[PDB]
Amino acid sequence: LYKIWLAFDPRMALIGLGAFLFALALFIHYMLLRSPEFDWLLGPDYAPVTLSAGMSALPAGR
Amino acid sequence: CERPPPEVVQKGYRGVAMEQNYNPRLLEASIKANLPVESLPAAAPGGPSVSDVYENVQVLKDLSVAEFTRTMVAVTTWVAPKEGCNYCHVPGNWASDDIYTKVVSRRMFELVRATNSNWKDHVAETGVTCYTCHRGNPVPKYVWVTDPGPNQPSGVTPTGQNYASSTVAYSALPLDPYTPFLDQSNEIRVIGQTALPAGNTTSLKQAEWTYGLMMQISDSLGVNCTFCHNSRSFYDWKQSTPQRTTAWYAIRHVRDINQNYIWPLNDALPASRKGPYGDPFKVGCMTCHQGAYKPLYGAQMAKDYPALYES
Amino acid sequence: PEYQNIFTTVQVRAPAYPGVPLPKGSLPRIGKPIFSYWAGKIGDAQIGPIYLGFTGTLSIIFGFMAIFIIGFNMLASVDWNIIQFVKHFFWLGLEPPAPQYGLTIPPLSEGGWWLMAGFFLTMSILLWWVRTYKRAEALGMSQHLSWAFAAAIFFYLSLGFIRPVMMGSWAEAVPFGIFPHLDWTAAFSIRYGNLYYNPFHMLSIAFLYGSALLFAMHGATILAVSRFGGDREIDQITDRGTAAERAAIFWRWTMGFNASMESIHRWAWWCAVLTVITAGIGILLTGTVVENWYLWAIKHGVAPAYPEVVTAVDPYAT
Amino acid sequence: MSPDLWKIWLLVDPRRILIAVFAFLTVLGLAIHMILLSTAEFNWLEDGVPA
Amino acid sequence: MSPDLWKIWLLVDPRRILIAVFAFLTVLGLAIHMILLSTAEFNWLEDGVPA
Amino acid sequence: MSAAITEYMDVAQLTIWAFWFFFAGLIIYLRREDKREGYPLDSDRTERSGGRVKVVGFPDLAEPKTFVLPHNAGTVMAPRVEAPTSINATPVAPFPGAPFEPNGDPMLSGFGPSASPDRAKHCDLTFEGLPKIVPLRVATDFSIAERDPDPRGMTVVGLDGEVAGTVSDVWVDRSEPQIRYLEVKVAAGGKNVLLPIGFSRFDKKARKVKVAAIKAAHFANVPTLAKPDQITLYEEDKVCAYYAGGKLYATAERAGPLL
Amino acid sequence: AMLSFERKYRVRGGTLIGGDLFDFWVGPFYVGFFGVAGFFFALLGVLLIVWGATIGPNAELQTYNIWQISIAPPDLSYGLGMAPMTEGGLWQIITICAIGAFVSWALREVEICRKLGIGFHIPFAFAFAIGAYLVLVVVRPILMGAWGHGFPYGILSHLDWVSNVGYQFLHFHYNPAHMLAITFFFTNCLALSMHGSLILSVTNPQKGEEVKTSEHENTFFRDIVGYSIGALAIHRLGLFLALSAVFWSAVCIVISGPFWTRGWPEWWNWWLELPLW
Amino acid sequence: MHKIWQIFDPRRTLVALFGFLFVLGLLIHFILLSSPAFNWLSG
């Protein structure tokens, strides 16, 4: 499908595609960091702290 | 720099932005540093009584020997685990009071017992334990003395402010709000409660002192101002949160602790327990909460030790 | 793409312009003008000469004394430690007198130095105002800048002199410090019940927001028509060209009404001036005729009411 | 300690030096007086002497 | 300490270097005195000596 | 003196109301200054009544103000009255508010983005009375900054990349030392036309001036000046407006729509 | 009506979308495709604001006092989902209408710029104001994880939101991007008064004086501060100051909560903890 | 001396000198007023 490169500048198409893919990769990595399930920066041996004796991590709200 | 999203707790009405923001990883680190100690196994009911077995028990005389022994084991873990049982006792003579730690700790028992029974407006059945402040250290980590502030030239009167201090969360606010408010009973309220002037002569400088105290309160509980206030009207109790009512009693509770328990013990304490102005290490909001909205994030340790309640 | 007229691509150098000749008996302009290349890329390359007359010289001497007193007291506050001075510099400040002194002159370290710094800074600002008045007069220009500067001075005097005198206490005035005067700003609003509900604070913000709105509109407008020589605003005012017509027509088609090349600067002048005029008035009303702005707003039906989803028991009402 | 030290006025402008020197000495003079006023042991106005 | 050390004045302007040195030495001297005044040990105005 | 004027009125309430009266008066003043140009309005309301109704809105017009131009160039009244002018276009549709289609060649129509008023037919003067916008051949003491490329000798290309000519000279503002126009020698008839700096995109690496406004063939019809070494305010508008028309008329695709 | 010099500028074309269909004028306004879309985006948003005022927070608190009218976002418990109409869903629709109206207004300015053959600085500058609004109601709420972080639509209630968000960081003045944004705002207001004064004082000179020249403008501020930026560059500077203030204001609010949760004065502990002191 | 006025402008110098003296005079009076021991406007 060479027709695409007849109508789109190869330098601008690669700059746009490269920036898009890099932005997409950064966004998806962050989306995994948002979820603690896939937050690999917590460490492979991550264990959530155990709450005992009526502990609550957060104050009560609404 | 932190990364989103924080854990947000909504306290007020929607759109009013009365919320608590917690970094989940910072919150995780704080909780791991504020874990409670597992309660000792319950003492065997019955047995000999403290009154007719021990000689110089002046506070815990209502207990049985089994519960009394359990209490001593627990306070050893809570206060002096490294120094052991001999930190508060003369070796070979338990009944001896000829050591300052024994005299202080006996008054500390009255402090805890009075707190767990008479200050439920603040500690609300969670109560306190020797561990709540000491956290396994003979000297509690977060105590305060009357701060002279930064060094000044001999002919310069200190302002007590305009100096980066962690006591006011690194603002330039008056850096020693503990002394006038958490030891003395200076008026915290500065805001006039009428639309038009009606004799409220409180200076703008006095608002900075209240602001400094509120920075220390919020830092001690790891919360922001909206945890207790609607910032559109700081004076107004009707728009505040129930935590503001608790904090009001906590201020009076801390004053009671410092004036009636810590201060009378000043003579007994060594020079290393006193500040430059000679006042002893005193109790602030940070002493128990240590950066959390509740000490040990609401862990309930006192209920397992009947020695920590008044009879 | 198209030249956006944001940076000057090619700069041209001419002999430095001495300035429009001043009338007889004026001091010669001091300084040999130089040409900064980077200043010429965004603006005019020539730096200097400056006119330093008698009034400007006196303003300098008064101004330095104020700044020196402030800095000395900042350095004294960290016990002369120059290293601690740099560390705490933003937090350092010269506090106004304590409340117990009222309007009297307290000792040096208890607000006396603040009064001297306040007075000397005020004199230099007033002297600088006279300087702006005379420079415009010497060039045959009108006194619009002096009027606008006087408006800013009025707000400055309201903050540190007029209101503290009205309140009868120097402790109400602004400390001389970076973070300390921000602490004063926050404490002022807290003390007098949420300055957001001061209607003259609301107006001041509207004009401060409007100033950024107008300069963004006007600045972008002139850059948009600069291809027609729209930056030459004097010529467009005296002899309306296509730059001024297209600029006016753009805003007429956009929002239904427009200014002229001259009157847009009257909108600009008044929006900026009203920012500090309303700022000064709102400060003078605070603490003098209104104790609590939120309660004033409640009295006048301005503060919204929210459903009571959270409330606190008042411990004083027992 | 140099017979040719007078040549410094060929390098630096004598007028700018005098302005800088006089301005610096005045500020230094004010600063030293203010340091002593900020020192209780040397504040000659608040030391109470003479009684 | 090279014999041709005098050639450095063919690279750096003597007037600018002299101004920079005099300004730096002045600010350096002020800084050291202020640091000493900040110390309890070397504040000669607040040490109570002589009594 | 108290803060309370009545049971409900207070000083702060009177002060804010006092501001609104001033602010209302101020807006009326500013709107009156706005209407010193382009008023009375041109409308079918006036056209259908035969000039009996003047459209000025509210506030009405102010009294004329005088601008005494320097070097006795005349006195210009801001709220003046201009002669009626006929546009070089026809309406696309007869309903009010409909746009107009320029007659003939749109680039040469003098309508729309290529429209321009008739400014004064005299040069803009410096403070000393010399012409302000002059070429570098007569502003001898003016020179290009050392770190910047000299525009003279650069190639001028149009919207389509076709060569239009070379920069023969640079026109500068004498009052404020900046480049205003590039004098381009058209390589079609050897006639020098001015190129405003606002329509010029310098390409320093290739020493090329890119003109996205118009094609290379359009440089032959750029309005020219009577005197080769000075330009009047009238001619400045004509030159700039011609290039501006290219932004809408140079190519068919520029009239839009995108989709 | 149209200005006495306006008729020669009313040309067909330059539309981004719609072509000849919407290319016309209504009174002074040019509508175009985005004027039609922008008007009905605005009309629906305004009508839903009035309806939100009509139902109010509840029946007892309902008010038509323009100061007290408030349309609040959802509770944070709804997250990024849609909320019921009376529980913040109205705010979500109004926000969408506002975004549609603002973008249509910006795009209508682009079409007007194309008709007049002028630069696109004005729609570009307006995009910064839109971007600041988008940060407040889209970017920051999404980063925070709930639409309830948007500010309520009310003249005074959105001030209560600003106050409480500010005190969520205990002292919002210490926000470094806030300090930078305020510096640009204050500098812009100063620069606007200076520019307005200089133009007015030159074109309206002393009594019995002729209009001054560009030399007088440059000489005037060189006599005062020793530097004159120039007649063209003051408009670059004013645009830069105004847009930088909004850019750094958008930064200051988007880092408050998403990228910083402690009190703002505590952020400066990086400087206080440098080993130099 | 006297040649000091060949390098110092008498017009600029006198204004700078008189301005400094006026500032100095104001400063000293302010310091004395601040001093309780030398404030002459008390009882």
Ligand code: BCL
């Ligand atoms: C703290 C203990 C003492 C005290 C201890 C000292 C000590 C020690 C000194 C002073 C000095 C000074 N003190 Mg004292 N001083 C005290 C309290 C005061 C009080 C007060 C209100 O109480 C005041 C107003 C002063 C004021 C003064 C100044 C007169 C003088 C600083 C001048 C200066 O800085 O010039 C700087 C500015 C200049 C412009 C310098 C240049 C001078 C002239 C104007 C330039 C031209 C010179 C001319 C050509 C010479 C011609 C000679 C040939 C004929 C050619 N002191 C207390 C009571 N004071 C200093 C002094 O004596 O300096 C002479 C000094 O060393």
Ligand code: BCL
């Ligand atoms: C302890 C506090 C004492 C006191 C002790 C002293 C002492 C000591 C001195 C003064 C001096 C002055 N005091 Mg006193 N003074 C007190 C209270 C006051 C009060 C008051 C309302 O309480 C006032 C208004 C003054 C005012 C004055 C000034 C008249 C004078 C400073 C002038 C100056 O700085 O010139 C500088 C500013 C200029 C512009 C200088 C230029 C002068 C003019 C423009 C040029 C004239 C040229 C001419 C030929 C030279 C002679 C000039 C003479 C002043 C006539 N004092 C109290 C009671 N006062 C000083 C003095 O006597 O100076 C003459 C001085 O040494």
Ligand code: BCL
């Ligand atoms: C206790 C509260 C805190 C505080 C908490 C906050 C919070 C929270 C915020 C700020 C924000 C700001 N603060 Mg702060 N701030 C405080 C104190 C100050 C002080 C001061 C003197 O003390 C100043 C000068 C400021 C200044 C600022 C600005 C930097 C900024 C607001 C401008 C802006 O965002 O533009 C942006 C402009 C817009 C968003 C306007 C959008 C325009 C839209 C596109 C068009 C609408 C069209 C309209 C509907 C048309 C109607 C039709 C009519 C007919 C005309 N703050 C105190 C310490 N501050 C805000 C910010 O930075 O946001 C980005 C913000 O959220």
Ligand SMILES: CC[C@H]1c2cc3[nH]c4c(c3C)C(=O)[C@H](C(=O)OC)c4c3nc(cc4[nH]c(cc(n2)[C@@H]1C)c(C(C)=O)c4C)[C@@H](C)[C@@H]3CCC(=O)OC/C=C(\C)CCC[C@H](C)CCC[C@H](C)CCCC(C)C
């Ligand atoms: C319309 C309202 C806005 C506004 C307007 C405004 N400001 C103005 C003006 C106007 C119209 C002026 O004409 C005036 C000006 O000059 O502008 C360039 C000014 C001005 N606004 C300024 C600042 C300013 N404006 C601000 C705000 C605003 N100004 C408002 C937003 C702010 C804020 C927001 O805080 C500031 C900080 C100044 C730049 C200037 C007034 C300068 C002035 O009065 O200076 C007095 C003199 C001094 C302080 C000199 C001290 C510095 C010297 C370098 C000391 C050393 C000298 C020497 C070496 C000493 C030698 C030894 C001695 C012992 C002799």
Ligand SMILES: CC[C@H]1c2cc3[nH]c4c(c3C)C(=O)[C@H](C(=O)OC)c4c3nc(cc4[nH]c(cc(n2)[C@@H]1C)c(C(C)=O)c4C)[C@@H](C)[C@@H]3CCC(=O)OC/C=C(\C)CCC[C@H](C)CCC[C@H](C)CCCC(C)C
């Ligand atoms: C970025 C630099 C500054 C700037 C620039 C700027 N603003 C601009 C422009 C530019 C360049 C325009 O060209 C454009 C314009 O046309 O100006 C006349 C505009 C404009 N800036 C405006 C306002 C404005 N700008 C502001 C700020 C700023 N604008 C910045 C400080 C503010 C502030 C700070 O509050 C306001 C209020 C308008 C006058 C206008 C854009 C008009 C517009 O978009 O019209 C469409 C919308 C309507 C006709 C009605 C609203 C429809 C909505 C659905 C209603 C709901 C709105 C909102 C969600 C709720 C209510 C808000 C509550 C807080 C009360």
Ligand SMILES: CC(C)=CCC/C(C)=C\CC/C(C)=C/CC/C(C)=C/CC/C(C)=C/CC/C(C)=C\CC/C(C)=C/CC/C(C)=C/CC1=C(C)C(=O)c2ccccc2C1=O
């Ligand atoms: C009463 C009634 C009918 C109520 C019904 C209300 C209902 C139901 C709906 C209404 C809401 C709807 C649907 C709105 C649709 C869109 C409409 C009509 C929008 C109206 C336009 C509008 C928003 C106008 C607001 C303008 C305001 C308030 C401020 C703009 C900023 C301002 C202060 C501008 C004044 C200064 C001016 C004129 C600047 C422009 C200007 C600049 C900036 C130059 O640089 C320049 C240079 C050289 C020559 C001229 C100029 C020039 O004119």
Ligand SMILES: COC(C)(C)C/C=C/C(C)=C/C=C/C(C)=C/C=C/C(C)=C/C=C\C=C(C)\C=C\C=C(C)\C=C\C=C(C)\C=C\CC(C)(C)OC
């Ligand atoms: C080169 O400089 C050196 C190194 C020599 C000294 C350096 C000094 C430095 C680093 C100074 C730094 C200063 C800074 C950072 C200052 C910051 C100042 C700020 C932010 C100020 C902000 C607001 C202040 C205000 C608004 C003050 C207003 C005060 C007024 C209007 C006071 C008026 C007072 C009067 C008129 C006094 C009257 C006194 C009466 C009693 C008559 O006097 C007797």
Ligand code: HEM
């Ligand atoms: C019953 C439980 C407690 C016991 C046994 C106990 C024991 C002691 C002892 C032995 C000391 C002296 C230590 C020393 O000086 O080296 C002491 C001091 C102190 N305790 Fe406690 N304590 C108890 C509960 C508490 C609580 C609940 C608080 C907080 C409110 C508290 C705050 C302090 C403080 C501030 C000091 C002074 C600092 C110091 O001297 O070390 N203690 N306690």
Ligand SMILES: CCCCCCCCCCCC[N+](C)(C)[O-]
């Ligand atoms: C610009 C200031 C206008 C005069 C303001 C005066 C207010 C200060 C208090 C005067 C009366 C004091 N006192 C105690 C006698 O009431």
Ligand SMILES: [Ca+2]
């Ligand atoms: Ca903390």
Ligand SMILES: [Ca+2]
């Ligand atoms: Ca003495």
Ligand SMILES: [Ca+2]
């Ligand atoms: Ca010391």
Ligand SMILES: [Ca+2]
């Ligand atoms: Ca000594």
Ligand SMILES: [Fe+3]
């Ligand atoms: Fe302008």
Ligand SMILES: [Mg+2]
């Ligand atoms: Mg302070």
